[PDB]
Amino acid sequence: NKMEAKIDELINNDPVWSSQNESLISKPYNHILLKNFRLNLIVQINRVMNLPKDQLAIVSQIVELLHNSSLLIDDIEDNAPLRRGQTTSHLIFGVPSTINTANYMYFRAMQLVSQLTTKEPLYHNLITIFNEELINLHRGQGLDIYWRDFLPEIIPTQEMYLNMVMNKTGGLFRLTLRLMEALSPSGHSLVPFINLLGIIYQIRDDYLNLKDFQMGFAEDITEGKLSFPIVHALNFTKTKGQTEQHNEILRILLLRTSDKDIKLKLIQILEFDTNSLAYTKNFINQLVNMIKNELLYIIDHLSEL
Amino acid sequence: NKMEAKIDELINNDPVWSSQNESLISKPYNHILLNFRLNLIVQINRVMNLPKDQLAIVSQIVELLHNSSLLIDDIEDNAPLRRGQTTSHLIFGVPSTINTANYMYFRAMQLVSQLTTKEPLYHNLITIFNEELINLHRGQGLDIYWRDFLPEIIPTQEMYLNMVMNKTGGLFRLTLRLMEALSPSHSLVPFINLLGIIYQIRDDYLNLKDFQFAEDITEGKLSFPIVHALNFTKTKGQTEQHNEILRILLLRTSDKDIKLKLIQILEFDTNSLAYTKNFINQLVNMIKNDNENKYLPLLYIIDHLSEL
Ligand SMILES: CCCCCCCCCCOc1ccc[n+](CC(P(=O)(O)O)P(=O)(O)O)c1
Ligand SMILES: CCCCCCCCCCOc1ccc[n+](CC(P(=O)(O)O)P(=O)(O)O)c1
Numbered sequence: 001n002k003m004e005a006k007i008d009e010l011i012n013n014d015p016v017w018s019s020q021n022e023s024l025i026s027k028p029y030n031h032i033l034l035k036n037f038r039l040n041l042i043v044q045i046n047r048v049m050n051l052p053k054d055q056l057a058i059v060s061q062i063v064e065l066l067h068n069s070s071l072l073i074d075d076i077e078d079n080a081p082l083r084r085g086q087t088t089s090h091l092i093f094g095v096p097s098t099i100n101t102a103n104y105m106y107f108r109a110m111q112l113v114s115q116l117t118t119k120e121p122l123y124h125n126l127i128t129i130f131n132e133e134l135i136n137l138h139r140g141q142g143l144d145i146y147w148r149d150f151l152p153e154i155i156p157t158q159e160m161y162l163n164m165v166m167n168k169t170g171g172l173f174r175l176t177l178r179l180m181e182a183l184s185p186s187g188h189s190l191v192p193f194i195n196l197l198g199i200i201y202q203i204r205d206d207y208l209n210l211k212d213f214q215m216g217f218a219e220d221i222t223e224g225k226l227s228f229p230i231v232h233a234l235n236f237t238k239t240k241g242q243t244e245q246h247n248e249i250l251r252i253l254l255l256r257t258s259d260k261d262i263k264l265k266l267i268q269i270l271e272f273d274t275n276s277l278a279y280t281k282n283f284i285n286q287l288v289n290m291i292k293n294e295l296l297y298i299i300d301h302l303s304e305l
Numbered sequence: 306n307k308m309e310a311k312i313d314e315l316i317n318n319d320p321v322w323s324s325q326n327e328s329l330i331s332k333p334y335n336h337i338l339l340n341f342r343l344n345l346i347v348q349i350n351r352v353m354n355l356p357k358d359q360l361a362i363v364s365q366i367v368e369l370l371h372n373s374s375l376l377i378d379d380i381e382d383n384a385p386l387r388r389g390q391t392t393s394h395l396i397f398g399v400p401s402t403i404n405t406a407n408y409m410y411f412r413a414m415q416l417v418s419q420l421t422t423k424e425p426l427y428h429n430l431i432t433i434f435n436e437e438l439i440n441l442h443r444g445q446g447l448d449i450y451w452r453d454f455l456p457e458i459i460p461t462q463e464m465y466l467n468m469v470m471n472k473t474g475g476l477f478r479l480t481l482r483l484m485e486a487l488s489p490s491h492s493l494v495p496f497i498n499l500l501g502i503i504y505q506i507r508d509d510y511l512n513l514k515d516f517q518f519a520e521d522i523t524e525g526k527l528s529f530p531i532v533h534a535l536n537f538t539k540t541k542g543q544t545e546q547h548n549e550i551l552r553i554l555l556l557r558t559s560d561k562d563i564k565l566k567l568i569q570i571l572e573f574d575t576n577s578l579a580y581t582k583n584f585i586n587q588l589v590n591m592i593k594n595d596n597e598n599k600y601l602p603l604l605y606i607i608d609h610l611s612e613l
Contacts, residue, residue, distance in 0.1 A: 003587060004587070004591055007499070007502075007588065007591065008495075008591075010466060010467075010470065010498070010502075011470075011495045011496075011498035011499050011502070011600075012495045012498075015440055015443075015444070015467060015470035015471040015474060016467035016470065016471075017440075017443050017467075017471060021443065021447055022443075024446075024447070024450050025443065025446035025447060025450055073403065073404075073407070076399070076400075076403065077399075077400040077403060077404065078400075093453075094449075094453055095380070095381075095399075096380075096381040096382075096449045096453065097446065097449050097450065097453060099377060099380065099381065099403060100377075100381065100442055100445055100446045100449055101446060103377070103407060103410075103442060104439065104442035104443070104446060106407075106410075107435060107438045107439045107442060108439065110435050111435055111439065114428075114432070120424035120425060120427075120428055121424055123424075123428060124424055124427060124428075127418075127431055128418065131411060131414050131415055131418070134411045135408070135411050135412065135415065136320055136322075138330075138404055138405075138407055138408035138411060139320075139322050139326065139327075139330060139408070140320070141404050142329070142330035142401065142404045142405060142408060143326060143329065143330070145398075145400045145401050145404055146329050146330070146401060149397075149398045149400055149401060162315060163315075163320060163321040163322075166315065166316075166320035166321065167320040167322060170320060191316075192316040192317050193316075195315070195316035196312070196316050199312075199315075199316070283308075286308060286309070287312065290309055290312065290313075
């Protein structure tokens with residue numbers, strides 16, 4: 001009778017959850033927090049959008065949770081040992097706790113959307129925006145992962161790479177921008193521009209990962225990523241009949257090596273044999289010119305987003 | 306010129322995603338697809354009476370969240386098997402399987418938007434979805450925390466039960482609350498919470514009894530019988546027995562003999578398996594002997610609960 005009484009109370013109440021419980025499972029998240037530029041981009045865009053400061057703070061909080069959770073998952077998916085100079089959370093807390101915590105935070109971000117407005121129709125549109133772009137992020141990330149983990153089953157072309165980026169990287173840029181446009185009390189949609197910034201952002205990220213090492217650890221090679229320069233190299237070699245170079249690029253990607261000389265050989269194949277680094281540097285410039293023809297500040301600090 | 310024209314087209318359209326791209330991303334999910342849940346949904350629909358097309362979407366939502374949970378749980382537990390078959394992550398890799406399972410959570414989320422077009426009620430369905438996914442993750446995070454930090458914290462039966470209310474109760478409550486909010490007709494949440502609890506304890510119980518693979522031991526899980534055994538030995542001041550249980554859990558062992566040794570500790574020293582069997586039987590009687598229908602508004606469901 002005492003047991004049934006205790007069970008009866010348990011099942012007729014909400015689940016018990018303490019602030020101690022909350023802190024214990026937030027460890028992976030508090031850790032990546034230790035790692036303003038994203039705020040700056042939102043603030044600049046707001047000069048166009050004019051959301052009041054309180055609503056903008058909530059948009060920013062949503063973005064931070066989604067961005068940091070994506071990073072925790074990403075580092076697990078990439079077997080990344082370091083993030084911004086420090087040990088990745090999954091190596092400290094384990095893969096299980098980090099996945100669970102990152103996913104928990106996607107839902108906390110979802111929860112915040114309801115703090116943006118009391119108007120049901122608007123609320124509906126905001127959640128639809130949140131839902132669509134998170135679908136988009138997972139689609140792009142799934143393609144990137146598939147190409148990499150199943151190489152050489154699929155050799156993406158430049159067009160395929162760009163479409164994967166539109167989903168993968170464009171997802172969070174458009175999510176932030178679309179919520180703002182929807183909330184704005186105030187010209188043409190800025191979605192095209194934010195798609196371009198996300199593409200510049202990704203290709204420049206791929207580029208610097210190698211260029212910094214040729215002159216960071218070029219960890220994209222260790223991970224076997226189908227980066228923009230690698231995609232150009234693989235298609236260039238196929239096209240020109242450079243069979244051995246095409247096969248060697250694939251072999252080095254498939255080694256998942258941390259040997260620096262092997263990584264340097266691959267980068268110098270890209271520098272002298274396929275001219276992929278020059279091709280990419282020129283591609284980024286052409287993309288930056290499409291705009292330049294506060295914003296420039298952002299574009300020069302794009303790598304700190 | 307040409308490069309810019311192509312980029313202009315690209316940024317001005319929605320992201321390109323093909324049916325073939327969708328198939329690639331779906332592979333880890335289709336693998337786990339290869340019934341009793343629909344049965345329980347149908348049965349409960351006699352009280353709720355949602356129209357059939359609406360009941361079907363609830364069922365699809367339930368299948369997405371449940372299958373996605375299993376794909377992640379198997380990664381979180383490093384499980385090599387799920388229903389006798391090789392787990393998805395060992396075939397498609399952990400990376401693709403985490404991403405695909407997470408993608409399915411959001412596809413589930415999109416189906417919620419299709420349950421109704423009434424803005425008020427829609428907000429309610431999303432709030433239900435959101436609240437219970439949050440609870441499922443709090444519960445699973447605590448279950449994982451105890452397992453991975455052992456022996457830092459040893460839960461008591463009461464702490465284990467609150468973990469289960471969050472972890473296992475979330476999907477039971479999610480499905481039932483959506484149905485109750487959609488009903489064109491007393492809440493059954495208390496009843497569904499109790500099923501949830503019976504479900505998890507019997508699951509913990511059978512993992513050890515079927516062996517008597519006992520994978521829960523290899524995982525170092527704070528299962529209901531283990532929680533009982535650890536707290537029984539502590540109370541009875543049986544220091545060496547308490548530490549022996551901890552040592553076997555900490556071995557993350559697949560050795561059949563060592564696993565049997567832990568079970569013999571639970572059978573002969575703490576009598577934990579008989580205590581659990583009796584605990585489940587009592588939970589079940591709280592329903593069987595519910596004449597004045599306090600929880601009830603079945604017998605078959607409860608007897609086949611181990612296959613939800
Ligand atoms: C209006 C601004 C809102 C916030 C903008 C957020 C900018 C960063 C977007 C990151 O997009 C992704 C998507 C998927 C994975 N990652 C991880 C990168 P990294 O491991 O190099 O840090 P990526 O794998 O894209 O190189 C990044
Ligand atoms: C009225 C129908 C409700 C939806 C169907 C509910 C079916 C049971 C859902 C159980 O939910 C969980 C939550 C967390 C983990 N698991 C996996 C179990 P297992 O690995 O033994 O299959 P668990 O690790 O909790 O024993 C299952």
